[PDB]
Design a protein around this ligand. Structure first.
Ligand SMILES: CN[C@@H]1CCc2c(ccc(O)c2O)[C@H]1O
Lengths: 278, 301, 50, 331
């Protein structure tokens, strides 16, 4: 009977991710005023979250619940490619925003000139194309397949992610580690700018910045690091990891996409659009 | 027929292409508005930030205007000849109460003459200059209603020049200038526009302050109660005028900060006619305008 | 001076009953009511826009 | 001295009260209501740089011109949605635009006291420059090709002759800075509104105001003639917009809403005059019944505040401006 209870919670998570990203995507397209240079990027995050919540999680929920992959061998490999592209796109997009906010604050008087509608599409397309070198290329060359559970790749009943030592390190570095270093570095410099500006205000007059800056970095770090710290150590030390442990951290990471719109919201423009939508 | 509709598309493409090129230029350029009274000497800042015979003729006429006004406000043939030329060419103590050009006294007593005395213009004077940053364009209104202010909503900052020394010119002029500052601050349309104000004639401020003939306490009773702030004050100046210097700033500052929080800041700068660094001061303050505007965006502040 | 002169001409202005003005104002609107697409939207084929 | 004028002013008000017998709403009570109007946005003409300030329909209703603080005055085609000509402006700020009845010339305003008459007919060049006002130019209109009527912030309205280049007649004696003017269909008279809450009409040939209306309490910013030519409506900064009939010398019906407390920027009648399309500072445009003095439909399709509103000579469609550079054409 415990299996029935777990299904309700998993079903709600899939529903929550679908509605949350849809509203953000709908608001940007429906209203021209909300559509801006910075808001063009969040459409990509909304698009990345939308496909992840509908074409990755729902199939993954069936895999755990039914304890078997009813679909064909090729489609399971296809699902893995879609599963990794969405995570790579979502994490990279958050890193792109970190670059966007860093340029606006640290180097003003050039943000209007550097960023443009034509320029916004180029970098967004580059981010998505970057996922192609991380998702499409492995399956085409079948390099994702591992010798433990060698028959798992062959058998169509159940398939598990068994990756070579090279890909596990390289993909984790590209998807999460490299965006992490960029995101932390620019946000630290942004915090210095806020501290300097606040100090200047107190100089000629008679912090809350950390609280709001913590949410953006904290949610990204809390919801992905436990998985990616384990996504690099299971391959080097096979005996250390447990099979159920790996899955539990993976689904924690999927919740970040569902909670992503909440972090990047509460602005006056989106609050108006929420009332207009409902 | 259908070719004309296709032809109209080609003409539309040229217009869209031409507008697209100017979109980057317009976005790069920054707009400022200069506000100041007649005696505020706003022309000095514009000239400092950025012929002689023509200026001399107006200056000579300006001397006659003060001379004629002084007689009416209180060698008659000589006075009549000037009021009505080499013959015409051949007061200041009471000039505070009367209305006169600031540089008229220097001209009357008598190469930086153009900077000291400049002919004003009724029309809007647009000043464009570059400080190695994005393009800067300064606009001057050039009336009691002041309805053109509501038209200005895209300017990054507003320059509000104040003649600090002109506190004894009761018609007090400074309180009148302060009164206009409250109206622009409490304007229902100037929500996201800051102000950069210059307390001009600081050197002239000390001279009036140093001399005990005019007491700031007479115009402002609270000045005696007001004490100098503990914050650092540049000196080279006596503390007697230094306390006076901060009081006029505090009066402007108290109204500016109390009314609104966020996207409404004032950047008081003490300035002098000789000083030419004011161009860099605006750029340093203009940079703070965009940052604080962006800090409030995304609720990062 | 001029305002008194300007207001002097205001005294010698013929006036009409408000009821007469209201009836004329209402009658004109009734006459032109049919020929107004804002009151009744034009047919899609008839409307040049769509 | 001033006592006689004050006594005369009180006597003038007494005549207006005596001239009133029945309320306008009393007569229009039996009139069937127009009902709710489902009003849509047939076109969304966009593609401009900055906030626009004024818009005027062409005589043939095919074209219209919009002027903006960006200094780019572009003439737009409504049906094909594509711009025809873009006229660069010597002055960065403009506060008015006007279209010739013949369509040959297009008049652009300006914060500087200049009213440039651009030549549409293939390089746009200024035909003449009209100047000579202390204040800013706020409105411009074309009685004909020869005559251009302009409003200034110097509390004076003047008529410009293109060939002479000088003010043929100057209309003075008005308190506040004049904001908006409208021209009657017969072109015999026109009106003018200032911040002094006073609305006056003038005779072009005579040059002296015929009637003075001072019903409003706040500054007024919009005014337009009824199609019949015997009445006009005024839009003030106060929430109320009143309708005046020149014959009755008094306000007939006041259009005010308790909930609405924002300002009003532009007003415009329909072709039949039943619908009074008025912009607002609340980011919405309201269309109210002229006779019943009751709201008929609410339209809030804009993001920034509406700055202009005009109706075609054919009456087919209405265009409202905005500070978001969005010319939303409603049909
Ligand atoms: C089974 N789900 C997979 C497993 C490992 C993995 C994911 C996403 C991005 C990566 O770079 C990964 O290595 C997950 O979506």
């Amino acid at each position: 009977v415990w299996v029935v209870g777990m299904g309700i919670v998993m079903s709600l998570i899939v529903l929550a991710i679908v509605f949350g990203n849809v509203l953000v995507i709908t608001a940007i397209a429906k209203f021209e005023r909300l559509q801006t240079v910075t808001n063009y990027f969040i459409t990509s995050l909304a698009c990345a979250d939308l496909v992840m919540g509908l074409a990755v999680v729902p199939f993954g929920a069936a895999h755990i619940l039914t304890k078997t992959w009813t679909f064909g061998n090729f489609w399971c490999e296809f699902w893995t490619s879609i599963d990794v592209l969405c995570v790579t796109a979502s994490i990279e997009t958050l890193c792109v925003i970190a670059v966007d906010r860093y340029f606006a604050i640290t180097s003003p008087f050039k943000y209007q000139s550097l960023l443009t509608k034509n320029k916004a599409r180029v970098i967004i397309l580059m981010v998505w194309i970057v996922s192609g070198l991380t998702s499409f290329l492995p399956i085409q060359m079948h390099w994702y397949r591992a010798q433990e559970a060698i028959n798992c790749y062959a058998e169509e009943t159940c398939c598990d992610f068994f990756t070579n030592q090279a890909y596990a390190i390289a993909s984790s570095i590209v998807s999460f580690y490299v965006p992490l270093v960029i995101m932390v570095f620019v946000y630290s410099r942004v915090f210095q700018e806020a501290k300097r500006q606040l100090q200047k205000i107190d100089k000629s007059e008679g912090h809350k910045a950390l609280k709001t800056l913590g949410i953006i970095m904290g949610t990204f770090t809390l919801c992905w690091l436990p998985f990616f710290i384990v996504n690099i150590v299971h391959v080097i030390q096979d005996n250390l990891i447990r099979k159920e442990v790996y899955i539990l951290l993976n689904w924690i990471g999927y919740v970040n996409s569902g909670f992503n719109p909440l972090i990047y919201c509460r602005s006056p423009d989106f609050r108006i659009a929420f009332q207009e939508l409902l | 027929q259908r070719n004309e509709e296709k032809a109209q598309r080609e003409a539309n493409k040229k217009i869209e292409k031409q507008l697209q090129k100017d979109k980057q230029v317009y976005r790069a350029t920054h707009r400022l508005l200069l506000l100041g009274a007649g005696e505020s000497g706003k022309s000095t800042i514009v000239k400092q930030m950025r012929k002689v015979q023509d200026i001399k003729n107006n200056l000579k006429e300006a001397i006659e205007t003060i001379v004629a006004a002084m007689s009416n406000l209180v060698n008659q043939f000589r006075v009549d000849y000037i009021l009505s030329p080499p013959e015409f060419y051949e007061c200041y103590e009471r000039s505070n109460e009367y209305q006169l050009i600031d540089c008229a006294q220097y001209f009357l007593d008598k190469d930086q003459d153009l900077l000291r005395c400049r002919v004003l213009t009724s029309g809007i004077f647009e000043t464009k200059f570059q400080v190695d940053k994005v393009n800067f364009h300064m606009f001057d209104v050039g009336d009691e209603r002041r309805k053109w202010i509501q038209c200005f909503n895209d300017v990054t900052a507003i320059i509000f020049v104040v003649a600090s020394s002109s506190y004894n010119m009761v018609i007090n002029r400074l309180q009148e200038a302060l009164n206009l500052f409250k109206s622009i601050w409490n304007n229902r349309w100037l929500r996201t526009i800051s102000v950069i104000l210059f307390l001009n004639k600081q050197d002239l401020l000390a001279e009036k302050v140093l001399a005990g003939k005019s007491k700031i306490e007479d115009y402002f009773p609270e000045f005696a109660r007001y004490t100098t702030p503990e914050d650092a004050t540049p000196e080279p100046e006596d503390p007697r005028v230094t306390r006076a210097k901060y009081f006029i700033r505090d009066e402007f500052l108290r109204i500016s900060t109390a009314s609104g929080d966020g996207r409404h800041y004032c950047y008081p700068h003490f300035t002098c006619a000789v000083d030419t660094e004011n161009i860099r001061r605006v750029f340093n303050d203009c940079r703070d305008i965009i940052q604080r505007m962006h800090l409030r965006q995304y609720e990062l502040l | 001076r001029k305002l008194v002169e300007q207001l002097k001409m205001e005294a010698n202005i013929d006036r009409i009953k408000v009821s007469k003005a209201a009836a004329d104002l209402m009658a004109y609107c009734e006459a032109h009511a049919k020929e107004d697409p804002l009151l009744t939207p034009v047919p899609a084929s008839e409307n040049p826009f769509r | 001295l001033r006592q006689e004028a004050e006594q005369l002013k009180n006597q003038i008000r007494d005549a207006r009260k005596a001239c009133a017998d029945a309320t306008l709403s009393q007569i229009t009570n039996n009139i069937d209501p127009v009902g709710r109007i489902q009003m849509r946005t047939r076109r969304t003409l966009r593609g401009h740089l900055a906030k626009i300030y004024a818009m005027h329909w062409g005589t043939d209703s095919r074209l219209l011109v919009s002027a903006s603080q960006d200094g780019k005055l572009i003439i737009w085609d409504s049906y094909t949605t594509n711009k025809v000509h873009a006229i660069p402006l010597r002055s960065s700020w403009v506060m008015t635009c006007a279209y010739a009845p013949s369509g040959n010339y297009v008049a652009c305003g300006g914060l500087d006291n200049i009213c440039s008459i651009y030549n549409l007919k293939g390089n746009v060049r200024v035909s003449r420059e009209l100047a000579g006002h202390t204040g800013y130019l706020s409105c411009c209109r074309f009685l004909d090709d020869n005559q251009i009527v302009t409003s200034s912030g110097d509390t004076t309205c003047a008529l410009w002759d293109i060939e002479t280049g000088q003010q043929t007649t100057t209309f003075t004696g008005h308190t506040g800075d004049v904001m908006s003017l409208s021209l009657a269909p017969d072109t015999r008279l026109f009106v003018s509104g200032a911040c002094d809450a006073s609305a006056k009409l003038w005779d072009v040939r005579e040059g002296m105001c015929r009637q003075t209306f001072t019903g409003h309490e706040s500054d007024i910013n919009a005014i337009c003639f009824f199609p019949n030519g015997n009445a006009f409506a005024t839009g003030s900064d106060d929430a109320t917009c009143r309708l005046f009939d020149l014959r009755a010398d008094q306000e007939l019906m006041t259009y005010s809403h308790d909930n609405i407390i924002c300002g009003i920027t532009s007003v415009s009648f329909s072709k039949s005059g039943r619908l009074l399309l008025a912009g607002y500072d609340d980011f919405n445009c309201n269309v109210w019944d002229a006779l019943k003095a009751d709201r008929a439909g609410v339209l809030a399709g804009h993001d920034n505040r509406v700055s202009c509103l005009g109706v075609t000579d054919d009456g087919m469609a209405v265009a409202t401006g905005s500070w978001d550079s969005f010319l939303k054409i409603w049909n």
